[PDB]
Design a protein around this nucleic acid. Structure first.
Ligand SMILES: [Mg+2]
Ligand SMILES: [Mg+2]
Ligand SMILES: [Mg+2]
Ligand SMILES: [Mg+2]
Ligand SMILES: [Mg+2]
Ligand SMILES: [Mg+2]
Ligand SMILES: [Mg+2]
Ligand SMILES: [Mg+2]
Ligand SMILES: [Mg+2]
Ligand SMILES: [Mg+2]
Ligand SMILES: [Mg+2]
Ligand SMILES: [Mg+2]
Ligand SMILES: [Mg+2]
Length: 121
RNA sequence: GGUAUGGGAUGAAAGCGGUGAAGGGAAACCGAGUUAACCCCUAAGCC
């Protein structure tokens, strides 16, 4: 796996992240795309950052795991950038997504954030 | 008067697009549509 993927995410945990992006897209507020996502982290707005595992070249999202740790924002890995874009509701792949307002997925992103803080070790 | 290189509508079993479309900007900022015939609006420039 790429060098920016720092920990293994179980399959059903990545599905919860995808499910959280869809629910937040419908009932809350998200940012999709690495530029919008990065700014959401720099500005302290992101409640959860979702990063695709198949980003090539890696340098597009390699800055995100360190930036999220500095800003105290949890992040989780997801296997497919195309599947992440669909979860964000766009016709194209998304290398990264940031959930700003989780909406009805607030409890879900919070269960993800706790186990992700674990997986950060 | 003609004329779009400017637009509106349309935009597919087609192309491109969050690895950033189109449009604006010196940049920051923007952040999901868009590409072309026909139809429709406009006529700076050109005839
Ligand atoms: Mg799926
Ligand atoms: Mg005329
Ligand atoms: Mg007239
Ligand atoms: Mg007239
Ligand atoms: Mg147009
Ligand atoms: Mg169709
Ligand atoms: Mg095809
Ligand atoms: Mg299409
Ligand atoms: Mg144009
Ligand atoms: Mg531009
Ligand atoms: Mg006219
Ligand atoms: Mg004229
Ligand atoms: Mg002449």
């Amino acid at each position: 796996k790429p060098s920016y993927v720092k920990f293994e995410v179980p399959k059903e945990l990545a599905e919860k992240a995808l499910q959280a992006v869809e629910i937040a897209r419908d009932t809350g507020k998200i940012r999709k795309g690495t530029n919008e996502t990065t700014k959401a982290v720099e500005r302290g707005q992101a409640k959860l950052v979702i990063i695709a595992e198949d980003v090539d070249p890696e340098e597009i999202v390699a800055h995100l795991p360190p930036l999220c740790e500095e800003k105290e924002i949890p992040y989780i890995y997801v296997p497919s950038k195309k599947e992440l874009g669909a979860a964000a509701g766009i016709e194209v792949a998304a290398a990264s997504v940031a959930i700003i307002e989780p909406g009805k997925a607030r409890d879900l992103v919070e269960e993800i954030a706790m186990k992700v803080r674990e997986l950060m070790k």
